[PDB]
Amino acid sequence: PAQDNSRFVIRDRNWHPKALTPDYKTSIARSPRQALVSIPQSISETTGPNFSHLGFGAHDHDLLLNFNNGGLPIGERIIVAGRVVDQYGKPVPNTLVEMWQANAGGRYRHKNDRYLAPLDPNFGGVGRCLTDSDGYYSFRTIKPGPHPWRNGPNDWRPAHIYFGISGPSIATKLITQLYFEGDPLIPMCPIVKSIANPEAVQQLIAKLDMNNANPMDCLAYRFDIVLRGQRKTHFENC
């Protein structure tokens, strides 16, 4: 069974978005008004699931083939790849990385999405993989389109892909959104701007990666993820 044998650097909750960010309207009623209660790390917080033995299908990481209904999906073929490290720069191997997104037209395959842009019969919108022994992951997909939404009267999400990363403990688990280099919608989005610090926003912008592209086939974007630094305990209980 799991053991308590490490501590995780405390989060900077002014680097992360705060809970109450009123331009993102749904955050108003879904943000706590009392302060979070700080607690010390115990084995409850410093352990977490390892997914080495979850069974992945052959195409779980490949959205061009994992919703095949007779052809290829329409849209910009891309590889999304990167490395998961902690804040000390250590790789995070064999960790679970999940991702989901709308199709090329900004339409999500979800019963609750009523946007008028059509579904693509060969695009599902979900991928998953484990990072390799050196902390690297890779997906193949279609670049998602921007999505309008009922926040302000003319609000549009930039193209984005959701990411979920487990890391070594429940203390490191994160969901975030990847955006794409140069997208003029990024500075305008009240969900991007839930993050107060512009340098933190830059950390979510995937860079065009020509070196990883397949000529005559697919482009590539690079998105590196940094999870909380993990260190050994020292001088504890003495």
Partner 1 sequence: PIELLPETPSQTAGPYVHIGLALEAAGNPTRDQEIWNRLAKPDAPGEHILLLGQVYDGNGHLVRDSFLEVWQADANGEYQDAYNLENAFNSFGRTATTFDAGEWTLHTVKPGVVNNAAGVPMAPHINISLFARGINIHLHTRLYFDDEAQANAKCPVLNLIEQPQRRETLIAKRCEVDGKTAYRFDIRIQGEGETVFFDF
Residue 215 burial class via C-beta count within 10 angstroms: exposed 0-12, middle 13-18, buried 19 and up: exposed
For Cl ion, the binding residues in 150-189 under the rule CB under 5 A are 150
Distance CA 145, CA 187 (A): 16
**CA distances (Å), origin 209, targets 120, 221, 223:** 26, 5, 10
For partner 1, the binding residues in 23-52 under the rule CB under 8 A are 24, 26-34, 36-45, 47-52
Q: Does residue 121 touch partner 1 according to CB under 8 A?
A: no
**CA distances (Å), origin 238, targets 38, 42, 233, 235:** 22, 17, 12, 6
- Widest pairwise Cα distance in the chain: 65
Contacts of 128 (CB under 8 A, 6+ apart): 56, 60, 61, 96, 97, 98, 99
230 is in the binding site of which of partner 1, Cl ion, its own copies, none (Cβ under 5 to 8 A by kind)? none
For partner 1, the binding residues in 72-91 under the rule CB under 8 A are 85-89
Pick 74 or 126: Cβ nearer its own copies: 74
Pick 47 or 147: Cβ nearer its own copies: 147
Q: Among 112, 46, 101, 110, which residue's Cα sits nearest to residue 75?
A: 101
Distance CA 238, CA 234 (A): 10
Pick 175 or 216: Cβ nearer its own copies: 216
Q: Could you tell me the smallest distance in angstroms from the CB atom of residue 211 to its own copies?
A: 5
Piece of 48-56, 90-98, 99-107, 196-204 that binds its own copies (CB under 8 A): 99-107
Q: Which of 3, 33, 134, 198 binds its own copies (CB under 8 A)?
A: 33
Q: Does residue 115 touch Cl ion according to CB under 5 A?
A: no
Q: Which of 124, 135, 144, 145 binds partner 1 (CB under 8 A)?
A: 124
Distance CA 105, CA 116 (A): 10
Pick 27 or 94: Cβ nearer Cl ion: 27
Pick 74 or 162: Cβ nearer partner 1: 162
Piece of 46-54, 92-100, 160-168, 206-214 that binds its own copies (CB under 8 A): 206-214
The H or E element that residue 193 is part of is none
Q: Which of 63, 80, 92, 99 binds partner 1 (CB under 8 A)?
A: 99
DSSP 8-class letter at 15:
T
Site for Cl ion, rule CB under 5 A? 149-150
